[PDB]
Design a protein around this motif. Structure first.
Motif, short mmCIF file in Angstrom:
data_model
loop_
_atom_site.label_atom_id
_atom_site.label_comp_id
_atom_site.label_asym_id
_atom_site.label_seq_id
_atom_site.Cartn_x
_atom_site.Cartn_y
_atom_site.Cartn_z
N UNK A 1 0.81 -1.20 0.00
CA UNK A 1 0.00 0.00 0.00
C UNK A 1 0.85 1.26 0.00
N UNK A 2 0.18 2.37 -0.31
CA UNK A 2 0.84 3.67 -0.37
C UNK A 2 -0.02 4.68 0.38
N UNK A 3 0.63 5.77 0.80
CA UNK A 3 -0.05 6.83 1.55
C UNK A 3 0.62 8.15 1.21
N UNK A 4 -0.08 9.00 0.48
CA UNK A 4 0.45 10.31 0.10
C UNK A 4 0.18 11.29 1.22
N UNK A 5 1.22 11.97 1.68
CA UNK A 5 1.07 12.94 2.76
C UNK A 5 0.28 14.16 2.29
N UNK A 6 -0.55 14.69 3.18
CA UNK A 6 -1.37 15.86 2.87
C UNK A 6 -1.26 16.87 4.01
N UNK A 7 -0.25 16.69 4.86
CA UNK A 7 -0.10 17.58 6.02
C UNK A 7 0.12 19.02 5.58
N UNK A 8 0.99 19.23 4.59
CA UNK A 8 1.29 20.56 4.07
C UNK A 8 0.66 20.80 2.70
N UNK A 9 -0.54 20.26 2.48
CA UNK A 9 -1.19 20.35 1.19
C UNK A 9 -0.81 19.19 0.28
N UNK A 10 -1.65 18.99 -0.73
CA UNK A 10 -1.39 17.89 -1.67
C UNK A 10 -0.09 18.17 -2.42
N UNK A 11 0.79 17.19 -2.62
CA UNK A 11 2.00 17.45 -3.41
C UNK A 11 1.65 17.86 -4.83
N UNK A 12 2.50 18.71 -5.41
CA UNK A 12 2.22 19.25 -6.74
C UNK A 12 2.00 18.14 -7.76
N UNK A 13 2.66 17.00 -7.60
CA UNK A 13 2.49 15.89 -8.52
C UNK A 13 1.22 15.09 -8.26
#
Ligand SMILES: [Mg+2]
Lengths: 98, 1117, 49
Positions: free
Chosen positions: B913-925
């Motif tokens: 599994x994967x988990x994209x961090x959103x603490x400082x906003x969604x990454x530009x990619x």
């Protein structure tokens, strides 16, 4: 005991040049697929992605001597068209040595 | 949409405005039209088409009324009806029957003298019926009728280069649906001529006069062209009668020059609808091209004098280079040549139309007999039953389904194979293109294929380009032209209105690309958009010029090509290879859906039909391996019997298994039982396993593959194969053969496993040479030799007159017997003439993966297993996990199929599994990623459509967001590579190696059925040479090029023994075999029989031929 | 020339040459390997097709 020292001809049609038929010393292997020396692939224009090959058995003493001397793979290192070596390192073997 | 659909997160960023239609409609709709089912009737009248007529209704109406030569007798047919089928599909397959239903048609005999009318219902025979899967059952085998691409009955103009003078020659031919041809051409000398019924050329003015045109009218109409006036001046024929006589003597050279026939034949050749017909599609094409009857309804399909004159005018205008033409009373139409490859000209004969044509032929044969014996039976005592002979129609239907080139055994290798077979478009076949004229020009990708025929999918055999696969969104115009949908675009805003266009009409509009960026309102957000225009040319146009758009990016590809992820990154050739290799996958013992795939895999699984779907919502009353019982909400009860270990047409196992639990609730249309090669109702053609991209000791050299022994121990790639052996006992000139257990001259060690009937017991294992069915045949005169008589004496052998011919397992085959099917005419079973009993035995074996077996991915990367390594020898990840497969690095770059690396990376991302961090906003990619993909657990399947899926940046970003392993350490870095250890030496590899999960599948090219050998065996009687093929135990070919190579080696003796001893030389062959077995040195060859007979003939010609030794020595022998 | 015409002139040696050349081309095509006994990994277009 029977198979020892009895050469067999390997061929892959079409035979564009004389090196398309070459004699080898057979040795028994398990399974059902023929094992071919990599260095002769260029001579046979064969790749191991599904190609097949035909095997012929010399019978008479003269035929065995001809296969053992004239047609043996180790005796056909050089191509007849220009005399340059044909059974030389290729693909992976180059990348390592490079 | 599907109630039981597993949640496969999708990377698609475009919303599909139209769902994928039923993939098998191309067959079911045609068959419904043929039988005139009420469903088709309603669906057709919905289109504003009043009183639709079915295929059988159309044929019967065209056939009748049949009128006697004197007019005193008549016969009419109408009202075709169908009753219930004799037996279900499964019963028919199990009993070698034909799935058919009775056909009844009401027939009325009419006597015009006394006015008698005799109306009854006539049984026209058992008409084969199509199943719910779009297939037929004939004699127990499942068959499919493929659509045929044929040139439409239009009018075609063309220009060519003269072979002699190199001038430009313009020609036209009128191609009817039924009847003779008519064509015109301008010769290299600027002389306009006409060929009627392919016969000798003559001036067109002759035909014009024969139709009643006077010289003045011809001058007035065709005065604009000097060549026509010159032809008229040089035409040495005057008057209508003389021209008619000339044409008559041209078409009937051997008949008397009577005026009545001379006038009649021309009228009855083209203009009267009895023997000439454009079939309502040729009429439409002719009207559209020539601009005739604009806006009128199609009243009749016969030819008329007006359109022939219009065609002549069109040809003359084309020759002189004019671009536009207007016909008196018509509408202006451009003047241009016709591309016969354009799908505005090619039309599709579906199964319905082919069967209609066959029925038409049968009824045409019937009509002759009917009208002939109308004149032999007593009048007024003649019922329709007395003269309705239904033998010819039944014979024609049987012939079409048994020997036609379009009805073929369904490609039942796997569900995708069968699904793609039902949607073929075959240019070859009767009425298509000639066998020897299939040149390289026709088998090419014309621009009009876009959206209606896939350019990638095609067989590798000799039919490359001649056989195509229908696209996913395409459908068939009731005229037979392939339509495809497009969204209407107005003022630059995309509208929800969808219109279906044919290739002929698509060229009149500008069509934008499917994935052009658009706003929420639909307006384009770019100043210039890529579009396709009239000539198939792709260009860039302003946002205000577009007229239509593609419904979705997947419009061009077919069902199979739609199942290749990252299809952008694979070259056309490798995409073709992968698409066709997907059709050769063999079902495994346990299927497993791919980690990374496409949304199509679900629908394709259901539309194939091999998955059982609950018809009505209800509760699963009872579930078992053999059957599923469902209690519907309304109280009705359904029972679905699952087919277990059934042998497909190609020897693969079609085992089904349930996926529901007793008491579970199932919605209508939900999948309740997995098919042969699906998991949870979606395609599972292969297995997803761990791959490391690196060379390894040369064992993967030249596209070879290395496998872990785990795949052998865990039966990951094991498959079950079933073979069907057959035998029968026939009547002979010495009597009838017999099946017995008492076969002569065999030890009890051989027949221990045979039953009382003489057939091998079910469950016993057999190996090559073992007896399956004991059979004996009567022999002729004995005439024992003295030695044989002595042997009879010394063993007390009582005389018997039978010889052993028992069925035996072929060379190199083994397995366990799983079933026996026995037929015998004594039980009323149908058998071939002169046969008493027939036995079929099923032998099943469990083939594991072995050296030489062929494996391949979906991207066209294929190889053979060159080595299977022990588990401890495989490179393993830092946590101890050993990799399953190793693929050589050198095969990826030059083949331009880098999509496999994309699949590897995305499969690794899916497994963990994967988990994209959103603490400082969604990454530009991550901006374009839908929120649903911001996180996922381990083993979370993902979807990536062919032309709208994961992007390079998104995948690169995801690779660095994977979850840790059990211990908390990430195995694969952000680049997709990992530090692998050496299984043998134990040292870590100096550089990181790309690691991931690839979906690879087992092809049906197993070495078990490709190895062959022969020392001595059967020989052909016609030419005396060894037989050919593995089945016949034949020898290998030694062509002339091999002889050239042997000559170049100077190996005279080897070549001589190959050409004589190992070939048609009986005496030498036997001598060499004897010498080898006895240990004697091989005897020398010489003087073949052919030379002996040639020498004898030379002597017979009084030529004193003799052979001399040495350089001028004596004779020898 | 219009009044006199030609006496249905035909050529014989040219037809023999054409026949021999077509036969040689047929032999050349026959010399190539057949589809029955190919050794390649998969079926493919041949010249004879
Ligand atoms: Mg190959």
């Amino acid at each position: 005991e029977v198979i020892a020292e009895h050469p067999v001809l390997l061929n892959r049609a079409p035979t564009l040049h004389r090196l398309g038929i070459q004699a080898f010393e057979p040795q028994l292997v398990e399974g059902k697929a023929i094992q071919l020396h990599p260095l002769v692939c260029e001579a046979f224009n064969a790749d191991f992605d599904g190609d097949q090959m035909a095997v012929h058995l010399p019978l008479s003493a003269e035929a065995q001597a001809e296969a053992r001397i004239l047609m043996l793979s180790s005796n056909n290192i050089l191509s007849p068209a220009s005399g340059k070596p044909l059974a030389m390192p290729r693909l992976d073997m180059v990348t390592g040595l490079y | 949409s599907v109630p039981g659909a597993p949640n496969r997160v999708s990377f698609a960023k475009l919303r599909e405005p139209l769902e994928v239609p039923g993939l098998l409609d191309v067959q079911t709709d045609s068959f419904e039209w043929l039988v005139g089912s009420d469903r088709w009737r309603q669906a057709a009248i919905d289109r504003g088409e009043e009183n639709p007529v079915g295929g059988l209704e159309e044929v019967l109406a065209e056939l009748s009324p049949i009128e006697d030569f004197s007019g005193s007798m008549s016969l009419s047919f109408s009202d075709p009806r169908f009753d219930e089928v004799k037996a279900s599909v499964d019963e028919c397959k199990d009993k070698d029957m034909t799935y058919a239903a009775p056909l009844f048609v009401t027939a009325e005999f009419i006597n015009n003298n006394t006015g008698e009318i005799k109306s009854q219902t006539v049984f026209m025979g058992d008409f084969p019926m199509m199943t719910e899967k779009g297939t037929f059952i004939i004699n127990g085998t499942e068959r499919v009728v493929v659509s045929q691409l044929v040139r439409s009955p239009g009018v075609y103009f063309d220009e060519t280069i003269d072979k002699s003078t190199e001038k430009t020659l313009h020609s036209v031919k009128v191609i009817p649906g039924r009847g003779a041809w008519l064509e015109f051409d301008v010769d290299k000398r600027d002389t306009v001529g006409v060929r009627i019924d392919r016969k000798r050329r003559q001036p067109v003015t002759v035909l014009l006069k024969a139709l009643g045109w006077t010289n003045e009218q011809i001058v007035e109409r065709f005065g604009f062209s000097e060549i026509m006036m010159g032809t008229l001046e040089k035409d040495t024929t005057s008057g209508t009668d003389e021209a008619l006589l000339d044409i008559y003597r041209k078409l009937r050279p051997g008949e008397p020059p009577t005026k009545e026939s001379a006038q009649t034949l021309l009228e009855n050749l083209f203009f009267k609808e009895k023997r000439y017909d454009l079939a309502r599609v040729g009429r439409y094409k002719v009207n559209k091209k020539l601009g005739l009857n604009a806006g009128k309804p199609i009243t009749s399909s016969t030819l008329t004098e007006e359109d022939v004159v219009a065609t002549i005018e069109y040809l003359v205008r084309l020759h002189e280079g004019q671009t536009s033409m207007t016909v008196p009373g018509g509408v202006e139409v451009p003047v241009e040549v016709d591309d016969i490859d354009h799908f505005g000209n090619r039309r599709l004969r579906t199964v319905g139309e082919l069967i209609q044509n066959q029925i038409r032929v049968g009824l045409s044969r019937m009509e002759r007999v009917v009208r002939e014996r109308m004149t032999t039976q007593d009048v007024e005592a003649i019922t329709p039953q007395t003269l309705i002979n239904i033998r010819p129609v039944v014979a024609a239907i049987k012939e079409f389904f048994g020997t036609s080139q379009l009805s073929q055994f369904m490609d039942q290798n796997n569900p995708l194979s069968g699904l793609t077979h039902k949607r073929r478009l075959s240019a070859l076949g009767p009425g298509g293109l000639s066998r020897e004229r299939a040149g390289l020009e026709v088998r090419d990708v014309h621009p009009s294929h876009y959206g209606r025929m896939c350019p990638i999918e095609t067989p590798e055999g000799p039919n490359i380009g001649l056989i195509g696969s229908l696209s996913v969104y395409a459908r068939v115009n009731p005229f037979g032209f392939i339509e495809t949908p497009y969204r209407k675009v107005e003022n630059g805003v995309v509208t929800d209105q969808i219109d279906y266009l044919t290739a002929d009409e698509e060229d009149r509009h500008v069509v934008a690309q499917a994935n052009s960026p658009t706003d929420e309102n639909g307006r384009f957000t770019e100043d210039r958009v890529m579009v396709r225009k009239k000539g198939g040319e792709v260009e860039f146009v302003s946002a205000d010029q577009v007229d239509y758009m593609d419904v979705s990016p997947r419009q061009m590809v077919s069902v199979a090509t739609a199942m290749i992820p990252f299809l952008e990154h694979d070259d056309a050739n490798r995409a073709l290879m992968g698409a066709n290799m997907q059709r050769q996958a063999v079902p495994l013992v346990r299927s497993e859906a791919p980690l990374v795939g496409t949304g199509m895999e679900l629908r394709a699984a259901i539309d194939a039909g091999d998955v059982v779907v609950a018809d009505k919502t209800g509760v699963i009353e009872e579930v078992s391996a053999d059957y599923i019982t469902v209690m519907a909400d309304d109280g009705t009860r359904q029972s679905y019997r699952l087919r277990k270990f059934a042998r497909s047409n190609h020897g693969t196992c079609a085992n089904q298994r349930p996926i529901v639990d007793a008491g579970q609730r199932v919605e209508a249309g939900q999948v309740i039982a997995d098919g042969p090669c699906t998991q949870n109702g979606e395609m599972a053609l292969g297995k997803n396993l761990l791959v490391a991209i690196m060379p390894w000791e040369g064992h993967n050299y030249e596209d070879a593959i290395i496998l872990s022994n785990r795949l052998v121990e865990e039966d990951v790639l094991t498959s079950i194969h079933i073979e069907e052996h057959e035998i029968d006992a026939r009547d002979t000139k010495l009597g009838a053969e017999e099946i017995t257990r008492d076969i002569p001259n065999v030890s009890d060690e051989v027949l221990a496993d045979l039953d009382e009937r003489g057939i091998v017991r079910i469950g016993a294992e057999v190996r090559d040479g073992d007896i399956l069915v004991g059979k004996v045949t009567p022999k002729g005169e004995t005439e024992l030799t003295p030695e044989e008589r002595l042997l009879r004496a010394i063993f007390g052998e009582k005389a018997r007159e039978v010889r052993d011919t028992s069925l035996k397992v072929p060379h190199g085959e083994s397995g366990k017997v799983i079933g026996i099917r026995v037929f015998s005419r004594e039980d009323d079973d149908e058998l071939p003439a002169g046969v008493n009993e027939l036995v079929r035995v099923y032998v099943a074996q469990k083939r594991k993966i072995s050296d030489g077996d062929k494996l391949a991915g979906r991207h066209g990367n294929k190889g053979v297993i060159g080595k299977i390594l022990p588990v401890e020898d495989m490179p393993f990840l830092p946590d101890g996990t050993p990799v399953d497969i190793i693929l050589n690095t050198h095969g990826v770059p030059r083949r331009m199929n880098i999509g496999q690396i994309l699949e590897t990376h995305l499969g690794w991302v899916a497994k963990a599994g994967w988990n994209i961090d959103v603490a400082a906003g969604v990454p530009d990619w991550a901006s374009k990623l839908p929120e649903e993909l911001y996180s996922a657990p381990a083993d979370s399947t993902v979807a990536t459509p062919v032309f709208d899926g994961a992007q390079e940046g998104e995948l690169a970003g995801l690779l660095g967001s994977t979850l840790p392993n059990r211990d908390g350490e990430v195995m694969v870095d952000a680049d997709g590579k990992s530090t692998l250890f050496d299984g043998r030496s134990g040292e870590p590899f100096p550089y990181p190696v790309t690691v991931g999960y690839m979906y690879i599948l087992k092809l049906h090219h197993l070495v078990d059925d490709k190895i062959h050998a022969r020392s001595t065996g059967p020989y052909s009687m016609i030419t005396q040479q060894p037989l050919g093929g593995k089945a016949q135990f034949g020898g290998q070919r030694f062509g002339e090029m091999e002889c050239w190579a042997m000559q170049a080696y100077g190996a005279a003796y080897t070549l001589q023994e190959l050409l004589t001893i190992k070939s048609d030389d009986t005496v030498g062959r036997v001598k060499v075999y004897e010498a080898i077995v006895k240990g004697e040195n091989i005897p020398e060859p010489g003087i073949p029989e052919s030379f002996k007979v040639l020498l004898k003939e030379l002597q017979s010609l009084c030529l004193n031929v003799e052979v001399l030794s040495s350089d001028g020595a004596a004779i020898e022998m | 020339v219009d009044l006199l015409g030609r006496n249905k002139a035909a050529d014989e040696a040219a037809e023999r040459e054409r026949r021999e050349e077509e036969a040689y081309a047929a032999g050349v095509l026959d010399l190539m390997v057949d589809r029955e006994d190919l050794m390649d990994d998969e079926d493919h277009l041949l010249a004879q097709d």
